[PDB]
């Protein structure tokens, strides 16, 4: 059932993830320092962290089979709308249910709900974000399923502004059938039970998290003194 092409797809995506996710988190020392000890003390550090992650998402997307057959405009539209969602997906790797925090190797780079609030965000986003991270973690995805979901998230034909939606759908369909077939052939029960439908539900959850983050980002970035603390890439991708 899992064809040669589908095994090839999975190998490329696993490699692309390995080349764009550094589980040592060594680069975090380059970011502006976290401030925790009211002001948005974490915004400089978390702006750099987000900006760093946007670069990784772009590097991943470029290696998705078929992605660079799209036009430049379509590649841009897809990354602009999905980047926030893939950052949330990718962040699940560091999330720990022990204390509902994101553990990036050390105490200074361990992020909880208070850190996210200290970048300007409210429980309207943070509570559903934690619920998302908990429900994704409980799926106990294979790494194969994790990177397929990130790629399916990126190549979505219903993103606003997409021009060649028929070609975007054809690329996504190739990835969806790869994932559907992978689960059916390689994910043993009971973990496989309704797994594809649960994964697609998480993509719907991401659309709602996307909407809420965009709402709060527009509110935060509308104030020039906050925008001053963002990075140029964040302003270009998330908006200005």
């Amino acid at each position: 059932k899992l064809s040669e092409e589908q095994q090839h797809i999975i190998a490329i995506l696993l490699d692309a993830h390995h080349k764009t996710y550094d589980p040592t988190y060594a680069d975090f020392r380059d970011f502006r320092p976290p401030v925790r000890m009211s002001p948005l003390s974490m915004l400089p550090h978390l702006a750099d962290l987000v900006s760093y992650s946007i670069q990784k998402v772009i590097g991943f997307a470029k290696m998705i089979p078929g992605f660079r057959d799209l036009t430049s405009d379509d590649q841009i539209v897809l990354l602009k709308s999905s980047a926030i969602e893939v950052i949330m997906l990718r962040s699940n790797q560091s999330f720990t249910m022990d204390d509902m925090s994101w553990d990036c190797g050390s105490q200074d780079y361990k992020y909880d709900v208070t850190d996210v609030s200290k970048a300007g965000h409210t429980l309207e986003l943070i509570e559903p974000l934690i619920k998302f991270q908990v429900g994704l973690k409980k799926l106990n995805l294979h790494e194969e399923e994790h990177v397929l979901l990130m790629a399916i998230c990126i190549v979505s034909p219903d993103r606003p502004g997409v021009q060649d939606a028929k070609l975007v759908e054809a690329i996504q369909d190739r990835l969806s059938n790869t994932l559907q077939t992978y689960i059916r052939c390689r994910h043993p029960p009971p973990g496989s039970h309704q797994l594809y439908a649960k994964m697609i539900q998480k993509l719907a959850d991401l659309r709602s998290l996307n909407e809420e983050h965009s709402k709060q980002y527009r509110s935060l970035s509308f104030q020039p003194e906050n925008s001053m603390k963002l990075t140029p890439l964040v302003l270009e991708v998330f908006g200005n």
């Binding site: 990354l79 890439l233 270009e236």
Partner: peptide, 11 residues
């Protein structure tokens, strides 16, 4: 909306 940094990272 020109996206030169995104476009450059895609190149």
């Amino acid at each position: 909306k020109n996206h030169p940094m995104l476009m450059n990272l895609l190149k």
